[PDB]
Design a protein around this nucleic acid. Sequence first.
RNA 1: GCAGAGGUUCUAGCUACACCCUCUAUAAAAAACUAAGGACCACACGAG
DNA 2: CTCTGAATCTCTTCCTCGTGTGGTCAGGACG
DNA 3: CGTCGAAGAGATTCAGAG
Lengths: 1337, 99, 79
Amino acid sequence: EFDAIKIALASPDMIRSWSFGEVKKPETINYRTFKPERDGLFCARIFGPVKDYECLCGKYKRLKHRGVICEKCGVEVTQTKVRRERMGHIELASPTAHIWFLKSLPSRIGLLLDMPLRDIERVLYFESYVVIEGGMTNLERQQILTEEQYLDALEEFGDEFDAKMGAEAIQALLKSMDLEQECEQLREELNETNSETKRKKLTKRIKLLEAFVQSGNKPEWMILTVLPVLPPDLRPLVPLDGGRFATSDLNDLYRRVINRNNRLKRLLDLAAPDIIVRNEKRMLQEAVDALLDNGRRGRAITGSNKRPLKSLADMIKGKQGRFRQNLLGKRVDYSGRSVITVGPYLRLHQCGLPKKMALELFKPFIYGKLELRGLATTIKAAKKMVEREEAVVWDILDEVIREHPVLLNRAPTLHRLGIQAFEPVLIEGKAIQLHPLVCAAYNADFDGDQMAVHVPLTLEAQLEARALMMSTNNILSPANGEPIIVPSQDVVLGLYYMTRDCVNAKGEGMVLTGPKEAERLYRSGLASLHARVKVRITEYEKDANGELVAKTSLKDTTVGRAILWMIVPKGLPYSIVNQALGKKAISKMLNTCYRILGLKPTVIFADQIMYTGFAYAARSGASVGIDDMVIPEKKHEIISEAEAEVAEIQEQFQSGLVTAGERYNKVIDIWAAANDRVSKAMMDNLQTETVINRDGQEEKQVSFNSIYMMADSGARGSAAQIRQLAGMRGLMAKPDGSIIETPITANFREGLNVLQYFISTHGARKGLADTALKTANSGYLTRRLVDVAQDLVVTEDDCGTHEGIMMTPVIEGGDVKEPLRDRVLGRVTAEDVLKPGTADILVPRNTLLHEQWCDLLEENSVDAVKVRSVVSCDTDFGVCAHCYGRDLARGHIINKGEAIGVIAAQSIGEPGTQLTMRSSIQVKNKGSIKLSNVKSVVNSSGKLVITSRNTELKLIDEFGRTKESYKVPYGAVLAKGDGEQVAGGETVANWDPHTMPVITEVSGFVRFTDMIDGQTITRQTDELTGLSSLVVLDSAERTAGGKDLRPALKIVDAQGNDVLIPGTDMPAQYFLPGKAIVQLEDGVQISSGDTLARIPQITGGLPRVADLFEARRPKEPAILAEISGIVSFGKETKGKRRLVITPVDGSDPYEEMIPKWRQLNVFEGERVERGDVISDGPEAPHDILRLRGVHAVTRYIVNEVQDVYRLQGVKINDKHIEVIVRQMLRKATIVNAGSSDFLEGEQVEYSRVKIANRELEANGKVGATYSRDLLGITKASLATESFISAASFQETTRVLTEAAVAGKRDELRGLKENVIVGRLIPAGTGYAYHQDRMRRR
Amino acid sequence: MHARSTGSYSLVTQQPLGGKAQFGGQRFGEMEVWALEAYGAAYTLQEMLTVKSDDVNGRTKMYKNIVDGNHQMEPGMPESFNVLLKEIRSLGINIELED
Amino acid sequence: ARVTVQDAVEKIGNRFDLVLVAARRARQMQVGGKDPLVPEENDKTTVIALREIEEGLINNQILDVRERQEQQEQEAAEL
RNA sequence: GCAGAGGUUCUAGCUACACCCUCUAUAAAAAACUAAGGACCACACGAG
DNA sequence: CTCTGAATCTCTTCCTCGTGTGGTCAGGACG
DNA sequence: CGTCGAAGAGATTCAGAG
Ligand SMILES: NCc1c[nH]c2nc(N)[nH]c(=O)c12
Ligand SMILES: [Mg+2]
């Protein structure tokens, strides 16, 4: 129908072309007469007739008179909708500069003339002359002049030239200059420029000039002379309110501008003095500025009631502007609202609906059905009978409701499952029912929550809300494969109470024919629900491919478990309904049923399980009583002993033995220990203490306490809350983040004191106030993440690439956080994974990995498996299908087209609500110690000593899997040796954390190179070791003479020769860092491992995730090695330490300035590699990307996010993080232009440059080299491909001005540029239609 | 309970006019559009955005199509976009549509 | 009535192609006068298409062949 | 409204997207066809 | 002395649906 | 009877030494 849109600066002739008339009269309408004024802002002649096919004089009133402009009233008779399309223009008497092109950040009107903004502000406001056409003078064309100085210039220069004033002067300056002329001289100046800052400013200016000269623009157009007016119906207007017509809108600004212009015209034809004309022109400019954007100046023009009245620019941007209020989120018809109800009976594919609501929703359908029946002759009669609510209407309504899904939409739909479909079931009452099992995905309580009901109208919508949105279609959440319909509160408790055992209940030891008989033996009351018995069960097996094998063995279980057997389908084995069946067991049971039985036999199972759970939680009578919450007897004694211990520490502090801080820490620690002790006592008196008879003596058995059963089953609450119900509350936090000295020693079953409640209110207030910020920040993070990806769609089925990011299990030193069987599952390998037996290809290179493959991978025990990921895919404008892996919603490869750009953004921004906003290392288990890339040196004590910090302590068993990882300090001493099996419990590394050892690579004597005792090292008398210890003076503390010299240690023999490092000619030089306490003397042999110098020595909240995605530079960035080379110094920290790194192969032009306070873990004798760390500290994403490729920034920016998300327990699959990473580093920069037409300094999208260079290489000419770049989400979104895609996200004024100046046409092709326009989005079912249409072109 | 099918519209022809004592349709807010885009559903999104909300030649067409018997659709183009075009064109910036 | 459509999406793998291939069948049953090949029973005209697809009686090729035959029949009457 | 005119009714009813009927100078015999003017700001409330 | 980085000043944005009350120009003669 | 706080990026300011 129409191609993409384009935006360009509006020419003064185009505005005249647009307008239908010309407004000269400020008054909108006569107050006395409703009809609008002839020259008024509301005008019949200009902006069409007021009523349909009616003039103003009433001469013509019928359609036969259409198209003929009346001569009496003067309005061209036509429909009223023409009143929202016609436009009018005011003719300003003095040229007026646009405010959007003046006060914006780069200030294009300033960049176009190369003059300060302040001078333009002065001349634009009639207080400073600017020289125009200076000629052969001492005044330049860009010179700023003052009134008195202008008068002096007039007296001095008799020639007729004179500096102008006002916006006319700027317009004349813009017209006089030639854009094409300055380009060549600017290019020459840039080439001759000796610096990069000046050349960068020149590149900005030259880019602006090129943008102007390419598109069809005229700089003079930035100063509008004729100004258009909005159409009348576009004015909000006032409804009849008794005769006031009052509201604050644009009409005030339009009236004031017209008044100012008319006054200016009158003054100009009256030959007013310049002192008055200048003031009038300044007032007119201020009025135009206020109209276009009220508030771009310091003064904000305001009407009555002292409120800043809205302007045009205020009705585009912001949460109130069109782009986020009327274009994206349109309110819809055929809607509804009501409160929630349990709705237990309806199956999980249907939901309730009040009759009094479904009658109003489906009104047109009822009209159509009545017309078909012949009951109503016309629509009027149908409306009458519908309002009658008689018997026939309900029968009709029970037809249009049969198979018509409706969308039950929750209010804050954070993720995809928020809005689901349901099949209506008409009920009485006035509340919307809801299947209980779906009250978890909605996160919908029943404390009066409110859902909104929508209706699909078209046939395609009805089919879509059936094939995609029905509650039986999305069982597994898109964030992770785990099911989302896990039984939640009552059904789980009922199942847990069903699956248990009491050691002596009636009907113990009996033999039962089968579950059909067990249900009867329990209903009769002859046998209790829990009783260990012997039953026979027909366990069906799917071991034969596609066949069900029936085996029956006399299995021993309880009556309750046996009754539960009939509910489960036949395929599942019996090793699932035999255990205690908490909550996680139920979720795993559902998952296995889905995995090995499909979907159709899992919906029925999950619907039947709720019925059984409710029915056997109702018979249980699981009530809570006071006697349940037992207070352990040990609590009083523990309290008394803790009081005694704190009193002892208090007496010690009063004796001066201990410090205040030390005593405070001791008190906190002992109180924590006492709290843990009392909690353990209460738990042991809660779970085990039940004792009963086994037909003989007493026996022990897990408790039946209701409070305990609501915690073990996981139905509601954990052990932490029960700790607050029976044991002591513990230590509470002050509002400032400190721990109060005295913990609350009273539980909730007991009385709580006044002080122990006033203390407790601090935490409640803080936690309740944090909701109003956690949600406010998670919303913004989710919005940025959505609008940064927003366009990823799986369009191609195979990239065909080869490289994929590595995948390895992640361990922090404890138990393995994530096995390789968890992360890898659902993805596709890159290279052929090999069996541990070499030259054996276990799995091909391009096969997807499902469960039957991960099980095989467990047998061979392989740790490193290459996996293709969406960061290395090469398909432009969309990721591949293979590169994305399993859809994670249905266990098959993702279909060609699914919108994965928004799925990941929703799945990452969803857990942002529950997320919190804020020696000796002992081995875990027996195994062999393996040190990767270690340079071990044997010390005097015989203990293993690592040379560099980069070596990490790891343990390897017979399977080769790293059980743990330990960070160890540089030059430390380790108890155990590498390549040696160690026992569990004992520490493999022991060292003093305060002391930093400084060991040498090789053994030998010490020689003080470039060292003088008293210049670089000042010997400090040590009162402990009995010997003055050589202490290195700090670089900023030592004298400048010693600054030139470099304090170092050299290894030498017994004769005096210098011993070279093995491999390198230059001898090993060990630079002694400042404030190093060396025990040995100058000329004493060093043991390889002995400590030469004993030197005394994240935020898991949402801000960490935000800073990670934003690619913000850390506060103290660790510097790295750009190119592999040998470390060298060029200066002596003259203001800053100087570092020069040169490769042994090629000479280096790269020298690095180093701050003098940054410790250098490298030595000038050491040779660094590319990407090697120089100074320790946090790393910067920008540095990593340009040093270690693109694959390396992912392994960090995904590991850190997962580390943040693992603490709270939430799980998000890695690919959802990876697509955001891919959308971040989408822009690229070209190092050299090559044969392409791109200017070397400009930034172009990676896809465009990749396609361009590939096409160039298709011919003889070589392509352009490129360097990848990283941008934060909030800056990458604003610099996207389309201007209208980023003009609805943030900073509307800047984006629109930048687009208009450059004439940046759009191409749509996105998911928001099509939502705004209102056509088929190219995301889902519309992808085929868009593909087709593209093929048409 | 508030549900409505058809009724009075606003100046920007966003028909629901705001659910209150006066008739209104619950806002298909910004996040609900993302929740629709997450699925493959686009036709229902188009009918939430064009025919239901604001399309002067879409509402009066489908109100006749439904009672006729066929559930078809014609997108038109939202009046809010024709408002945004005017609010940018009246700013001294010429924004148009190609063909 | 059908609640789980997994049987249908095996015939039309995309499950985005399924909706587009069932909408045409439903239109040919609402506007067009053609009769469903599956035995209709009280069901609306939007699940009959899914029922036909489940039986394998309809796919993206059969309906195109049928409309081509309709075009040929119309050409026969043109003479 | 075949064009002009009038129209049962089931507000108003050759355009709002409209539509149909009978009749020959002007209204009166008849059934089938549609859904309207509502801005901004403060305070309080609920839920996630 | 001229960038070198280093302060220093300026513009931006800070969730998402409802349920309700109340208050409100512009600009008063003028011939 | 009309009619006359916060917090972060970025663009100015601005600086220090060899
Ligand atoms: N209002 C008079 C009248 C009666 N019947 C009508 N039928 C149509 N189509 N239009 C009309 O105006 C009338
Ligand atoms: Mg609630």
